[PDB]
Every structure is written in structure tokens, then in C-alpha cells.
């Protein structure tokens, strides 16, 4: 049978993203809009700096709706994210930039009418003024990564971890270690998964007609690791 959360994702769903950030006291806000098509694991989003970013756009990609991952039919019982909808879930991360600062993020992801909303607060501390982040030394591109998911029964949620490699302009790599937890907002049951991963690929681009600081993101996400 089709779960109620799952039914909410059978078509193209409009997405709204809102982020308030403060990194080493540099405050900024970003809004994003686009659509997600979970059947194909496809996200298309454009973000605009509303209130220039103090950090490189690529460092925000992971923060900027895992309910849009394509879960293969045979892994349907392991899709925590959709099972929490529409009431939603709270996602939390700490992102450790190697030899630099850290982001702590908290997002509430839920439906408001037909729109899937990702509302985020981000706090960055301990960054080096001359480092790859505040010094803007990261290339505008993105590698493919796997994201590893496991149940946290005691918390009625999941724990997730993965390592992002950001290409630096000198050919090197800035590592960003991600630690994540998700908890349902509702009091109802959710699907607690067996260990598995999401395979991501991402492409960053610019809108040639857009004069505001912005980022266009195309992302494909597919669950795997259970056969």
C-alpha cells in the first residue's frame, strides 16, 4: 500500500526555502524557490541573497528537503522523510569544516498547503578570516557523495553522517564533516529505516539574467544499499 506521506510526493511539488544565517557575526538571509520530483529524485532550486553572501555558496548546498530522494520500490519501508509528512520533521546538523569553523543548523521541513517549506536557521562560529570559507577560496562546483542513514529508535528518528569535499581554487580539498539528526514534528508513527545511503549528484549554475547574488542548484538523489 501507499503511505499517506508518500502520496504527497507522487507529482511535482513546489518548494520554498528560507534561511537566516549568522557566520562569525556576518548576518544574512537567503530565500529559495523551485520544485522537487521525488519519483525521479530531482530537485531544481534557485536561491537569492535577500538581506553578497559572507560565505561561499557551495558551503550552503547541503543545508538548502530529503523527502525528495528517490526511494526504490523495494526500499519504500525505509523512507523516514516522506513518512513524517505533512506534519514534518526537524533536521539538525553540525558541519565541521576541517581546520576551520563549524555550522550548526536547524530546519523545520513541512507542508504549508501544497508547498513543501524548508525553514532554516544557521549559526557559524570559529571561522578563520583568511580561511577557505570567509576568504572565499572555494570553487563554484560540487562533487558527488554518499549520505549514510541509520535509525535512532530511542529518538523516534534517524541519524545521518557524511563527508563533503569542496574543491579549493588551488586544486586541494576543503573537507566538511556532516553530523545530522532528524525527528518528527508530529506524534504519529514514522518509518524507521535499516542502514542504507542516499547517492547525491549536484550541479551549480548561474541565471545569466540575475543581478542579485544567487545560486541555481540541480540535484539528483537516489536511495540505495539495500538489496
SS3 of 131, please?
A: coil
Tell me which DSSP letter residue 70 carries.
B
The correct CATH number of 1-227 out of 2.40.155.10, 1.20.1280.260, 3.40.50.2300, 1.10.287.110 is 2.40.155.10
- State the cell numbers at 191: 518509518
Q: Which long-range contacts (CB under 8 A, 24 or more apart) does 171-177 make?
A: 174/97, 174/98, 174/100, 174/132, 174/133, 174/137, 174/138, 175/97, 175/98, 176/59, 176/62, 176/95, 176/96, 176/97, 176/98, 177/95, 177/96, 177/98
d(CA 31, CA 29): 7
- State the cell numbers at 190: 514514522
d(CA 93, CA 153): 18
The answer to whether 200 and 221 have CB atoms below 8 angstroms apart is yes
Would you tell me how many other CB atoms lie within 10 Å of the CB of residue 69? 24
The residues, ordered by sequence, that sit 6+ positions from 7 with a Cβ below 8 Å of its Cβ are: none
Tell me which DSSP letter residue 12 carries.
E
This structure's resolution (Å) is: 1.8
Cell match 520544485: residue? 35
Quote the longest CA-to-CA distance of the chain.
54
Structure determined by: X-ray
Domain boundaries, the chain: 1-227
Q: Which long-range contacts (CB under 8 A, 24 or more apart) does 26-31 make?
A: 26/54, 26/55, 27/51, 28/53, 28/54, 30/60, 30/64
81 φ, ψ to 5°? Answer: -60, -50
The answer to whether 124 and 101 have CB atoms below 8 angstroms apart is yes
d(CA 46, CA 108): 19
Amino acid at each position: 500500500m501507499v503511505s499517506k506521506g508518500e502520496e504527497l510526493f507522487t507529482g511535482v511539488v513546489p518548494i520554498l526555502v528560507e534561511l537566516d544565517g549568522d557566520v562569525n557575526g556576518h548576518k544574512f538571509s537567503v530565500s529559495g524557490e523551485g520544485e522537487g520530483d521525488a519519483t525521479y529524485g530531482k530537485l531544481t532550486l534557485k536561491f537569492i541573497c535577500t538581506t553578497k553572501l559572507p560565505v561561499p555558496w557551495p558551503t550552503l548546498v547541503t543545508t538548502f528537503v530529503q523527502c525528495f530522494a528517490r526511494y526504490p520500490d523495494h526500499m519504500r519501508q525505509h523512507d523516514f522523510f516522506k513518512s513524517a509528512m505533512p506534519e514534518g520533521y526537524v533536521q539538525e546538523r553540525t558541519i565541521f569544516f576541517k581546520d576551520d569553523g563549524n555550522y550548526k543548523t536547524r530546519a523545520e521541513v513541512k507542508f504549508e498547503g501544497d508547498t513543501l517549506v524548508n525553514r532554516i536557521e544557521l549559526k557559524g562560529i570559529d571561522f578563520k578570516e583568511d580561511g577557505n570559507i570567509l576568504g572565499h577560496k572555494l570553487e563554484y562546483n560540487y562533487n558527488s557523495h554518499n549520505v549514510y542513514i541509520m535509525a535512532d529508535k530511542q529518538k523516534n528518528g534517524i541519524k545521518v553522517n557524511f563527508k563533503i569535499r569542496h574543491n579549493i581554487e588551488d586544486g586541494s580539498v576543503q573537507l566538511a564533516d556532516h553530523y545530522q539528526q532528524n525527528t518528527p514534528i508530529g506524534d504519529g508513527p514514522v518509518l524507521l529505516p535499516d542502514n542504507h545511503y542516499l547517492s547525491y549528484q549536484s550541479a551549480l549554475s548561474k541565471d545569466p539574467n540575475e543581478k542579485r547574488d544567487h545560486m541555481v542548484l540541480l540535484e539528483f538523489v537516489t536511495a540505495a544499499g539495500i538489496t
